[PDB]
């Protein structure tokens, strides 16, 4: 059976870009506090330089139909193509959205993509459509499917811009193919899984592994 993405799962949004004839994988990331704007974290060189996945992890909070979303605004389901989804940043608990402002010099029509404090409003919601015709609207989204994300409010694709020398992420009319790679689906209670923050205690001796206090001579 092919795994299906379902709500409450944790995912990372990946895009591939060709640089110097070499494919490079990038994950959509955002800091949250102190910086709403989203950027791209490269994960191709993970073997040499580990990436910063904590800010890349997202949660599939909700997955509605378009009309159901309309009613909801007026007032573990599987993801289906053509359904609006809500994505909550794991670290900051802010929802990915399409911001009104734009910093893009290359593209006037494009808008910035960033985190938003509240889930209220059309901005937070994104609609997912099949990347290739072999996928068909209304079908379940199988893990590892290329998909296109269109902002509900702006009718703009989630787009990767290469016009500037540095790679940027923005919402525009040119479409970019994205992959949703799952980080976790459901953890059996009381079991350690990757990506958790934890303390390593020396047996039960109430001693923990740590580094020196701040301003220490050993430079921590």
């Amino acid at each position: 059976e092919v795994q299906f993405l379902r709500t409450d799962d944790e995912v990372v949004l990946q895009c591939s870009a060709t640089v110097l004839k070499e494919q490079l994988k990038l994950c959509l990331a955002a800091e949250g506090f102190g910086n709403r704007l989203c950027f791209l974290e490269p994960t191709s060189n993970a073997q040499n330089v580990p990436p910063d996945l904590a800010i890349c992890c997202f949660i599939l909070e909700q997955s509605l139909s378009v009309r159901a979303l309309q009613e909801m605004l007026a007032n573990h389901r599987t993801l289906l193509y053509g359904h609006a989804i809500l994505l909550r940043h794991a670290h900051s608990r802010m929802y990915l959205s399409c911001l009104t402002t734009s910093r893009s010099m290359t593209d006037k029509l494009a808008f910035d993509v960033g985190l938003q404090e509240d889930a209220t409003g059309e901005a937070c919601w994104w609609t997912m459509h099949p990347a290739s015709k072999q996928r068909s609207e209304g079908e379940k989204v199988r893990v590892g499917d290329d998909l296109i994300l269109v902002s509900v409010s702006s009718e703009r694709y989630l787009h990767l811009s290469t016009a500037s020398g540095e790679l940027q992420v923005d919402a525009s009319f040119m479409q970019t193919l994205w992959n949703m790679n799952p980080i976790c689906s459901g953890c059996e209670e009381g079991f350690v899984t990757g990506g958790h923050v934890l303390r390593l205690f020396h047996g039960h001796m109430d001693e923990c592994l740590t580094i020196s206090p701040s301003d220490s001579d050993d430079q921590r």
Binding site: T106, D107, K108, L109, A110, E155, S172, F173, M174
Partner: protein, 49 residues
């Protein structure tokens, strides 16, 4: 081809506006199609350059 563009824009305006009032059903569809095909806006409106 600005001339052909002008002709087709003219058919579209007649569908979008009737008797001095806009028709929402056609207007939304036309706007969505135009944005989905940016070249219709012409070279100038094109975002990249």
């Amino acid at each position: 081809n600005p001339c052909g563009g002008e002709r087709y824009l003219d058919f579209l305006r007649f569908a979008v506006f009737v008797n001095g009032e806009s028709v929402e059903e056609n207007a939304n569809v036309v706007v969505r199609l135009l944005i989905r095909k940016p070249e219709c806006f012409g070279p100038a409106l094109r975002g990249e350059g």
